[PDB]
Amino acid sequence: DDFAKLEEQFDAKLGIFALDTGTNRTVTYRPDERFAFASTIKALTVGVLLQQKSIEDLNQRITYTRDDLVNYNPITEKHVDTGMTLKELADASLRYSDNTAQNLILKQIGGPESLKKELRKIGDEVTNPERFEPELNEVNPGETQDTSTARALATSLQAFALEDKLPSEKRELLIDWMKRNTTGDALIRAGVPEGWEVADKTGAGSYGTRNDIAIIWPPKGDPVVLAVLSSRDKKDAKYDDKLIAEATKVVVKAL
Amino acid sequence: DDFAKLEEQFDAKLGIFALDTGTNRTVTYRPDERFAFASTIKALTVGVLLQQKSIEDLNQRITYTRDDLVNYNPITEKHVDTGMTLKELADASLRYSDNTAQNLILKQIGGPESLKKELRKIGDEVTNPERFEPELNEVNPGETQDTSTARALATSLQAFALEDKLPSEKRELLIDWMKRNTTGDALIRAGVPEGWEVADKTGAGSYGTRNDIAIIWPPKGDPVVLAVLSSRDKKDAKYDDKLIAEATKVVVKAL
Ligand SMILES: NC(CC(=O)O)(CC(=O)O)C(=O)O
Numbered sequence A, B: 001d002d003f004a005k006l007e008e009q010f011d012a013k014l015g016i017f018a019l020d021t022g023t024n025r026t027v028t029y030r031p032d033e034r035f036a037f038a039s040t041i042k043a044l045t046v047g048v049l050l051q052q053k054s055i056e057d058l059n060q061r062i063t064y065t066r067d068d069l070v071n072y073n074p075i076t077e078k079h080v081d082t083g084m085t086l087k088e089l090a091d092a093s094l095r096y097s098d099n100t101a102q103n104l105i106l107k108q109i110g111g112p113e114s115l116k117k118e119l120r121k122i123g124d125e126v127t128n129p130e131r132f133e134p135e136l137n138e139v140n141p142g143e144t145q146d147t148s149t150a151r152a153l154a155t156s157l158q159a160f161a162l163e164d165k166l167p168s169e170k171r172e173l174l175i176d177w178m179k180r181n182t183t184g185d186a187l188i189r190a191g192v193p194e195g196w197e198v199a200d201k202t203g204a205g206s207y208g209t210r211n212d213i214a215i216i217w218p219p220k221g222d223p224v225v226l227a228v229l230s231s232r233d234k235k236d237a238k239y240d241d242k243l244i245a246e247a248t249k250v251v252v253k254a255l
């Protein structure tokens, strides 16, 4: 099949799960193999934040200094003294793959163990968060620390975005933030036909991991949730986004 | 494999889909082949009913005559001279597979063709109501009148019992009626381990059709959605409920 080809063509390993929520038509390809989830754990993080705070609640004055920053801070670097509220960090984590927002947010929710135990509670026995950013990308092959599967990660995304795990308000926020991500214009979004709406969170990590997790709406129907993950066998290996775009089109077509 | 062994052991074609609504792990087998659906449609019919009617609405007295009665009305034949409320006809419909009850309910929602359109609305592009009881069961092979599939019956059952297509009080009510069905102790019920709660809705048509659809809940863990359909090649063929129960055993093990 066309997924096996793309893996040869790109010298890379792919993981796919998509679900037509309106038909329970699926599309699977290594759906339970582990990949370092990378920055995609960011959506699920905000997933549990929103689960602990009303829309009203998410305006908390939260502060941080120069030292709290880490290795890539496109938004948090503008607002040292300024300070940013949960909303705006959730915006930054989600819209710009801000490493520091993720970290500061993660403290709010009580560290990677809590995240884990919360992920345990909704029904994800797979996603294994252990560390903050950037270290969390430090994943060697066969380790489970900070990995999940395509299945696990769509399902967690679905539960937050589209199930009863979140009230209307809080959920339209997630969808929104994600609908307007800046980072995935060459991932999932480049693989769906002109003018279907897309909410996505992307990731990159060592061993050439490039990941995208999305809900995507046609013009007519129920949304497809989907994770597309990939990796390579060289630690310092580089990724091709066009791996994901392509994968997605094979997903769309199949559905 | 496992399912095809059953198919040859019992000399019947099998239609199985199942979704672990916590993991999206699935069991499928001919999940998109079409079967005459028989009384299984009864649960979707009450799903639709509950979409349109309030609870107090369910107190209305429907009267009927010995003429309004068909060829298997185990409760409705006993109340011709006093009528029954809609609540009482739902019950009788669901728990005893009461045909007249279906025919009067089917009639309260706009007849087969309004039953199609509501099922199109939720996203069931497969299920195809056309007739009332008992003529709906008169389906020859090739025919798509009065057929649906495992993926579609199951998805549809899910929509009503679990999703957002009804409010929670109405879920609970559909679920309760379905938890107390009298007619399937020997099928899905008979194929799951002790302490697994089942709400299910059997059926049987010609060509030896024997179906069962259910939400089934383990002691701890998320609900599992479950259609098991079956048919055979000869038209006057008897069914065996051992087929549907042994097949469920395969689902529970696989799952
Ligand atoms: N921000 C990145 C990945 C990440 O930092 O998790 C850019 C990259 O590192 O290639 C993205 O495109 O999501």
Ligand SMILES: NC(CC(=O)O)(CC(=O)O)C(=O)O
Pocket (backbone or CB within 6 Å): B038, B039, B040, B096, B097, B183, B202, B203, B204, B205
């Ligand atoms: N209503 C039936 C089958 C049907 O008409 O769909 C009666 C029977 O078992 O013969 C049922 O009880 O499931």
